[PDB]
Amino acid sequence: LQGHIIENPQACVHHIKRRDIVLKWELGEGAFGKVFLAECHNLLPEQDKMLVAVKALKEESARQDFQREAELLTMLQHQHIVRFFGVCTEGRPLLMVFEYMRHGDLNRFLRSHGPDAKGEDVAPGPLGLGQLLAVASQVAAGMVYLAGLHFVHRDLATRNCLVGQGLVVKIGDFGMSRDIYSTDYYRVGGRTMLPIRWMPPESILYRKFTTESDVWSFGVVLWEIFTYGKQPWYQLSNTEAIDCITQGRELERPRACPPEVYAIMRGCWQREPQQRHSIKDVHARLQALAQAPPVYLDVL
Ligand SMILES: O=C(Cn1c(-c2cccs2)cc2ccccc21)NCc1ccccn1
Numbered sequence: 691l692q693g694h695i696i697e698n699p700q701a702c703v704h705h706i707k708r709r710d711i712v713l714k715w716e717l718g719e720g721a722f723g724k725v726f727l728a729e730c731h732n733l734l735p736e737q738d739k740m741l742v743a744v745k746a747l748k749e750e751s752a753r754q755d756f757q758r759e760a761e762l763l764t765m766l767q768h769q770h771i772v773r774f775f776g777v778c779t780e781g782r783p784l785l786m787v788f789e790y791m792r793h794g795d796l797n798r799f800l801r802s803h804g805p806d807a808k809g810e811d812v813a814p815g816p817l818g819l820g821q822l823l824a825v826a827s828q829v830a831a832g833m834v835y836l837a838g839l840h841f842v843h844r845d846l847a848t849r850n851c852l853v854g855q856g857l858v859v860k861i862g863d864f865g866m867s868r869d870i871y872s873t874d875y876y877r878v879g880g881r882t883m884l885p886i887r888w889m890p891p892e893s894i895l896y897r898k899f900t901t902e903s904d905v906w907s908f909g910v911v912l913w914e915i916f917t918y919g920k921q922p923w924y925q926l927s928n929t930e931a932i933d934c935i936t937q938g939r940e941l942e943r944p945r946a947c948p949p950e951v952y953a954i955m956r957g958c959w960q961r962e963p964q965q966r967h968s969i970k971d972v973h974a975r976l977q978a979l980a981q982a983p984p985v986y987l988d989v990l
Pocket of ligand 1: 691692693696698722771772773774836841842843844862863864865866
């Protein structure tokens with residue numbers, strides 16, 4: 691499905707004993723399975739006992755797909771990709787073990803730290819310019835890594851990023867986005883749900899997905915960040931958003947967004963995929979601004 695790692699045409703899979711996993715409570719549930727918070731014993735040398743997110747898959751094709759999923763997730767090792775620890779194949783259900791990200795999905799985190807909201811890692815009130823850039827740079831670093839391994843995401847959006855302790859941001863999700871954020875998808879035939887608001891015209895019109903369609907989605911992610919998690923084209927219905935995107939309309943500059951950052955967004959939104967800036971360049975630009983001294987960021 692769109693955004694699933696198995697859509698990539700790209701064993702060393704680590705196994706965990708069922709006894710080493712102790713389920714605490716459910717974190718969520720979707721069409722593909724349930725996600726629990728659990729304690730995992732003897733996983734990391736110093737740890738002894740550590741918190742993890744455990745995806746219990748619903749279930750053949752399912753067992754075959756599971757193995758291909760774990761192989762692909764095992765290939766990923768980067769500071770800005772949600773860590774995959776391994777599987778549990780003893781008994782049912784089959785389990786996938788991941789690191790636990792304390793602050794939840796990036797969309798929820800932006801909204802809870804934005805002007806429309808009701809203090810350990812973040813100051814009171816809306817996130818500052820420097821925090822917004824740090825968040826953007828980290829998502830970009832994750833996208834640089836995936837592009838380097840020739841992976842295509844297809845569902846890049848803040849809902850599909852997680853936030854951990856110390857404001858660490860990583861790309862990853864436990865396959866519940868269509869269930870938690872159903873309004874972020876356009877349902878085509880009772881089953882297929884498309885994240886049209888994050889998609890470029892070649893993906894909507896021609897159903898083509900590449901590193902360049904992901905860079906367009908990154909531009910939309912940049913916009914979500916600088917709007918504090920607001921839905922792109924929120925004022926438009928699903929058909930009206932398809933019309934705007936195909937007609938070549940671009941999202942307005944967010945109020946918290948400096949001109950320099952908006953130029954980075956527009957670079958991701960070139961009609962011709964070939965003309966879009968590389969993620970490597972997008973990352974270098976955002977990282978530079980993120981680590982800029984307060985004197986420089988204050989005038990931006
Ligand atoms: O596989 C993913 C997302 N995903 C990840 C990760 C998921 C966790 C940690 S990293 C890496 C990756 C690399 C290329 C493309 C997608 C990728 N999500 C699960 C899903 C999506 C849709 C429907 C059902 N299940």
